[PDB]
Design a protein around this ligand. Sequence first.
Ligand SMILES: *[C@@H]1O[C@H](CO)[C@@H](O[C@@H]2O[C@H](CO)[C@@H](O)[C@H](O)[C@H]2NC(C)=O)[C@H](O)[C@H]1NC(C)=O
Ligand SMILES: *[C@@H]1O[C@H](CO)[C@@H](O[C@@H]2O[C@H](CO)[C@@H](O)[C@H](O)[C@H]2NC(C)=O)[C@H](O)[C@H]1NC(C)=O
Ligand SMILES: *[C@@H]1O[C@H](CO)[C@@H](O[C@@H]2O[C@H](CO)[C@@H](O)[C@H](O)[C@H]2NC(C)=O)[C@H](O)[C@H]1NC(C)=O
Ligand SMILES: *[C@@H]1O[C@H](CO)[C@@H](O[C@@H]2O[C@H](CO)[C@@H](O)[C@H](O)[C@H]2NC(C)=O)[C@H](O)[C@H]1NC(C)=O
Ligand SMILES: *[C@@H]1O[C@H](CO)[C@@H](O[C@@H]2O[C@H](CO)[C@@H](O)[C@H](O)[C@H]2NC(C)=O)[C@H](O)[C@H]1NC(C)=O
Ligand SMILES: *[C@@H]1O[C@H](CO)[C@@H](O[C@@H]2O[C@H](CO)[C@@H](O)[C@H](O)[C@H]2NC(C)=O)[C@H](O)[C@H]1NC(C)=O
Ligand SMILES: *[C@@H]1O[C@H](CO)[C@@H](O[C@@H]2O[C@H](CO)[C@@H](O)[C@H](O)[C@H]2NC(C)=O)[C@H](O)[C@H]1NC(C)=O
Ligand code: NAG
Ligand code: NAG
Ligand code: NAG
Lengths: 49, 167, 49, 236
Amino acid sequence: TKCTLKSFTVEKGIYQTSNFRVQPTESIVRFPNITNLCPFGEVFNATRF
Amino acid sequence: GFQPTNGVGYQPYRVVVLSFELLHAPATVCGPKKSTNLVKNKCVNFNFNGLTGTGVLTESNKKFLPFQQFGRDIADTTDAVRDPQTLEILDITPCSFGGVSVITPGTNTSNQVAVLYQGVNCTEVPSTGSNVFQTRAGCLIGAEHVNNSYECDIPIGAGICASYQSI
Amino acid sequence: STASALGKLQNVVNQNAQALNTLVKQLSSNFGAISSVLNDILSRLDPPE
Amino acid sequence: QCVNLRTRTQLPPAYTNSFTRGVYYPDKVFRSSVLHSTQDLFLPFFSNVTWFHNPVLPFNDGVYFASTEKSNIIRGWIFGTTLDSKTQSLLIVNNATNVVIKVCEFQFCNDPFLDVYESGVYSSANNCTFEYVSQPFLKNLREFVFKNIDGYFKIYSKHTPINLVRDLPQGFSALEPLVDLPIGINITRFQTLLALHRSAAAYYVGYLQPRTFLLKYNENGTITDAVDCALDPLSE
Ligand SMILES: *[C@@H]1O[C@H](CO)[C@@H](O[C@@H]2O[C@H](CO)[C@@H](O)[C@H](O)[C@H]2NC(C)=O)[C@H](O)[C@H]1NC(C)=O
Ligand SMILES: *[C@@H]1O[C@H](CO)[C@@H](O[C@@H]2O[C@H](CO)[C@@H](O)[C@H](O)[C@H]2NC(C)=O)[C@H](O)[C@H]1NC(C)=O
Ligand SMILES: *[C@@H]1O[C@H](CO)[C@@H](O[C@@H]2O[C@H](CO)[C@@H](O)[C@H](O)[C@H]2NC(C)=O)[C@H](O)[C@H]1NC(C)=O
Ligand SMILES: *[C@@H]1O[C@H](CO)[C@@H](O[C@@H]2O[C@H](CO)[C@@H](O)[C@H](O)[C@H]2NC(C)=O)[C@H](O)[C@H]1NC(C)=O
Ligand SMILES: *[C@@H]1O[C@H](CO)[C@@H](O[C@@H]2O[C@H](CO)[C@@H](O)[C@H](O)[C@H]2NC(C)=O)[C@H](O)[C@H]1NC(C)=O
Ligand SMILES: *[C@@H]1O[C@H](CO)[C@@H](O[C@@H]2O[C@H](CO)[C@@H](O)[C@H](O)[C@H]2NC(C)=O)[C@H](O)[C@H]1NC(C)=O
Ligand SMILES: *[C@@H]1O[C@H](CO)[C@@H](O[C@@H]2O[C@H](CO)[C@@H](O)[C@H](O)[C@H]2NC(C)=O)[C@H](O)[C@H]1NC(C)=O
Ligand SMILES: *[C@@H]1O[C@H](CO)[C@@H](O)[C@H](O)[C@H]1NC(C)=O
Ligand SMILES: *[C@@H]1O[C@H](CO)[C@@H](O)[C@H](O)[C@H]1NC(C)=O
Ligand SMILES: *[C@@H]1O[C@H](CO)[C@@H](O)[C@H](O)[C@H]1NC(C)=O
């Protein structure tokens, strides 16, 4: 209050000093089900090259 | 002329070369996206299917059509989302915030004050200090609630105010 | 019975609501930039750019 | 079996009135009991929609297709520029079990027709790039909207039980999004396919223009009414 009012004495009343905000805790990432894999199996494990 | 005994230099080696092309057509192959689990009733930041934002998530009861992904109420502010895996509607609420104010009886008299958080429910204050009161104007810490009624000294709001006796 | 008698108060409320609505609507304009979301620009460009 | 039958059988190219048909959901956003104005490619109200009852019609920049039908003689569609193997071509076909979409350089017969004795329309097929199989699309009115933008082919569809005798009804129904395809292609003309047995059908075609519309969303997010801004001063 003294800092915002810039004085060493404060008169009777109510003063607004600052704000208040809740902070986030963690992060969440969601995406659809993983499927339709590329067919690398039949290329690398092909019998004949 | 491959033979079982030819040393490392003459062994047959299988070679596969991968070349990546970015023609102007839209991309059709991308790596796995990966995902985490779901939390609720906590102020977190989320990245639902590319839609990012902060807030607190609750279970809702809206009825999306089988093809919408998210909804907005008015002035283009998102309110509801659909999780890509479970396929249920979740509601987003901005994390609580507001101004703070100090009530003092004047440095001339004493130097004990009270704190008021404006428009903030008395559930997430921080800390504790002294007895805490919940009013239609917000939450108040550091004053005692009485049952009498006098002339108004320091107007607080919603028809209530404080004075000095303690505060 | 008759309505529209309290025109002035309704007009004041409508004007205030409309002003707030257009103020909050103004938050979705590029102003000649490349996007309207801060996070997209932060994650799609080098900070000096 | 690449044969030819005739040049014409009835040739009724006529015009009729669109009334207030051809509305589709512009995006995947949910809104409840609100009024929203949006600018996009639509079919103007009370437009002049062409009716046939079979040449290579132009595509321009979007197509609205309608057909009242029973026993679904119409099968699918063909899209492309030169309609030969010198450029990529799109084909959509349907049978009793699945819908098939292909993107290849075909050599279509001059008079495509399927019959049964899923080939015979294309004399060759090579350099195939995109394939897709899904659940089949199809007295009853079938409405479709075809759009192509930014290498994306969008299809909206709707089915309606009607009993009106001749033309489109004086109703209103939004068109739900159906299919999106990520293929780069330059569609400019298109053609319709009929699997008529060895022994010519009514369908309506309209075009789309960019304009602004006003839409009403009810409490459940369904579109119930629309207003075309540039129709008359009252609408403005
Ligand atoms: C080719 O086959 C081998 C043999 O199964 C694969 O190697 C296995 O990979 C799995 C994971 O996918 C591991 O759990 C096994 O331990 C591996 N076994 C051996 C002997 O290496 C290999 O992944 C296949 N190649 C491709 C490209 O899929
Ligand atoms: C994504 O995969 C998960 C894992 O299988 C699916 O979760 C299961 O869904 C079935 C569908 O009825 C349930 O019977 C199971 O109990 C679920 N498993 C759980 C909850 O552990 C999920 O449905 C998939 N999402 C899709 C396909 O969109
Ligand atoms: C501050 O938050 C609490 C916790 O949600 C609120 O208490 C809820 O009040 C509603 C309505 O009376 C009840 O249905 C819930 O069961 C209560 N929850 C709990 C945990 O008690 C409280 O009402 C909020 N403060 C204000 C002023 O609304
Ligand atoms: C309908 O069209 C499909 C288009 O391919 C025909 O082909 C069958 O498609 C299913 C679905 O993938 C496959 O499981 C079958 O193996 C395909 N058949 C063959 C011979 O490859 C299908 O036969 C057609 N059905 C009818 C009744 O006309
Ligand atoms: C066969 O298909 C391939 C794959 O799309 C074509 O190759 C590309 O075609 C596009 C379309 O003009 C070009 O922009 C690319 O530069 C081509 N890339 C390569 C590596 O060729 C090909 O043109 C098609 N036709 C033939 C005869 O091969
Ligand atoms: C679709 O058509 C456009 C124009 O009709 C093609 O754009 C041309 O692309 C070539 C090679 O990139 C350029 O040399 C030309 O100058 C472009 N023309 C114009 C008018 O911009 C585009 O390549 C075509 N795409 C396909 C897949 O056929
Ligand atoms: C919009 O959704 C509501 C909520 O489901 C629908 O109201 C239900 O409609 C069914 C079918 O007539 C009734 O069996 C239920 O009793 C209704 N529930 C309630 C709480 O009234 C409503 O029909 C939907 N459509 C419209 C136009 O409102
Ligand atoms: C408070 O004010 C009174 C008069 O205004 C003065 O006499 C007294 O000394 C003051 N007390 C302080 C400054 O502590
Ligand atoms: C007096 O105050 C207490 C707590 O401050 C409250 O519970 C009570 O209802 C009030 N009134 C009476 C008559 O006790
Ligand atoms: C369509 O245009 C023809 C002239 O080409 C006209 O005779 C007919 O009335 C029009 N139909 C409308 C505007 O519904």
